[PDB]
Design a protein around this ligand. Structure first.
Ligand SMILES: [Zn+2]
Length: 194
């Protein structure tokens, strides 16, 4: 009873149902879906088991300031990513990553680039002009931050929650953020207005 078996009833339909961004930015987690790149190949078969879930903030020396995403940044170096095999990573998170990660993921994925990163975010963290930059440089090259809407939803739902009796979730409100959130990716990616 996990991500390949089944999550919890009050997990997605409870929190992921008409609830953009977690009640409290913490314990972020992204599910990974990767293909196999064989110097021209791209095995996009049924490949997806989930990913890491790390948080930046804390209350001790452990406070490093790195999220599942930066955790993903670590998956590559261990993955033997590219040097051994290029995979098309497509992670599904509850929301954006962070500007700080924008620089981290960028340097490795953007400034370097040799792997695919698709981080689905139900809602771009918008407090006072933050996060927007995170996906900006990332979605631009350090990590393609996609919008977690109805489409990414059906995929998200079954990403962790097999179904437990429910094929796909509707949400609806995510459609609103679809035009908004997505419109932002295009507005932040290249500092575009509309
Ligand atoms: Zn981050």
């Amino acid at each position: 009873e996990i991500l390949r078996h089944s999550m919890d009833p009050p997990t997605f339909t409870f929190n992921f149902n008409n609830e953009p961004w977690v009640r409290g930015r913490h314990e972020t987690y992204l599910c990974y879906e990767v293909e196999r790149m064989h110097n021209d190949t791209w095995v996009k078969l049924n490949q997806r088991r989930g990913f890491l879930a790390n948080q930046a903030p804390h209350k001790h020396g452990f406070l490093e300031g790195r999220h599942a995403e930066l955790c993903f940044l670590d998956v590559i170096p261990f993955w033997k990513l590219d040097l051994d095999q290029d995979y098309r990573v497509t992670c599904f998170t509850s929301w954006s990553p962070c500007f700080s990660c924008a620089q981290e993921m960028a340097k490795f994925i953007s400034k370097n680039k040799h792997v695919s990163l698709c981080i689905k975010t139900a809602r771009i963290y918008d407090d006072q002009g933050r996060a927007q930059e995170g996906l900006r440089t990332l979605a631009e090259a350090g990590a393609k931050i996609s919008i977690m809407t109805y489409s990414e939803f059906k995929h998200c739902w079954d990403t962790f929650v097999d179904h437990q009796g429910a094929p796909f979730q509707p949400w609806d409100g995510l459609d609103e953020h679809s035009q908004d959130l997505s419109g932002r990716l295009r507005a932040i990616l290249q500092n575009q207005e509309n």
